[PDB]
Design a protein around this ligand. Sequence first.
Ligand SMILES: *[C@H]1O[C@H](CO)[C@@H](O)[C@H](O)[C@H]1NC(C)=O
Lengths: 187, 204
Amino acid sequence: RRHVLLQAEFYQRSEGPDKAWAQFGFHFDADELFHVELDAAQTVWRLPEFGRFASFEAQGALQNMAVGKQNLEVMISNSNRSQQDFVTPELALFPAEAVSLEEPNVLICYADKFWPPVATMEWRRNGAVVSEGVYDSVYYGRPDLLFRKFSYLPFVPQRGDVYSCAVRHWGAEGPVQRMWEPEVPEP
Amino acid sequence: PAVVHSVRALMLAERQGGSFFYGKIGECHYLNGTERVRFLDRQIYNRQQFAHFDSDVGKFVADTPLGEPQAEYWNSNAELLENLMNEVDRVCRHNYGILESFTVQRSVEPKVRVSALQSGSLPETDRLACYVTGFYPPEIEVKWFLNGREETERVVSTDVMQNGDWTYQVLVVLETVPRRGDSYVCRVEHASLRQPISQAWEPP
Ligand SMILES: *[C@H]1O[C@H](CO)[C@@H](O)[C@H](O)[C@H]1NC(C)=O
């Protein structure tokens, strides 16, 4: 079989509302080995245990950030500031494991096939925002130079509880949303 | 631990509302592991790759007109082209040896559960669901057997879904109203498994 190891870097800024972002990550096929938290200058392995088997020098990421942020200003110039059509995210929402009532589980929400790589996820239960235990991923490179981002909500399935995931993409005046609810048959 | 090696940003782009995006993607493609290794450096502005470097070609190739000025300049510097070619051993070969144990040879077994789903129009089970969860690698085979016979026509399967935590899942539904004295078996084949998992469904 064939495998791919990716060093993916992105450096971006928006001017309408002024904001800027940067990312450095290593990806094995479609999964993330690690990302460097560029402000803390800290390597964060997607699974803690990966850290015991290998290490990465975060200084290497920041040296690349110096050139990234320069190349970005050059190509803004070289392109007469040309713009790309945004691409609104699709949304997947599903549990990690088949649901048994009172058995702890995780709801997984991913935003897929979106560009630019700026998107925030909001979890609601029964209409009310929930943030406890949530993990938000970095932006994972997807075919056609698009991105995917994952959010995880730990939850205990109970009768009567409706859950929602909403994504706000940079461009849009509107969220993309999905609902999920346990299906419990009758004996 | 052992040190993962990063491709340095040796090349610099040369000058020649709004959102503005620049991307660098250094791809270490492995075929038969270390037997054949290809390094692709992709340079992207917005969603258009303006140029790339192929280890096999050994030179930068412009994918768009905007990439033509950059490719010519980078190709002028022979030391850069040599340094980029050295990344096939420096990054791709080096990193493969450190990460193969917990990546290329990751094995996590599927967990397999069958449950009955109710019709929603009638007081009966209309579907049997085989939840296959928590597995790596992503490639898997899940098959329904009714009284020893493989069913294809009445089975609807989801895509294999990335959980994002290095595990994958798939749901294979058999459309049937279960009958007492009938055998319903979900059979799962995966690289992690010496013997396939045959998960039978029994009523109450
Ligand atoms: C920008 O594009 C070319 C160079 O890329 C420049 O000559 C021209 O003045 C600009 N194009 C427009 C505004 O027609």
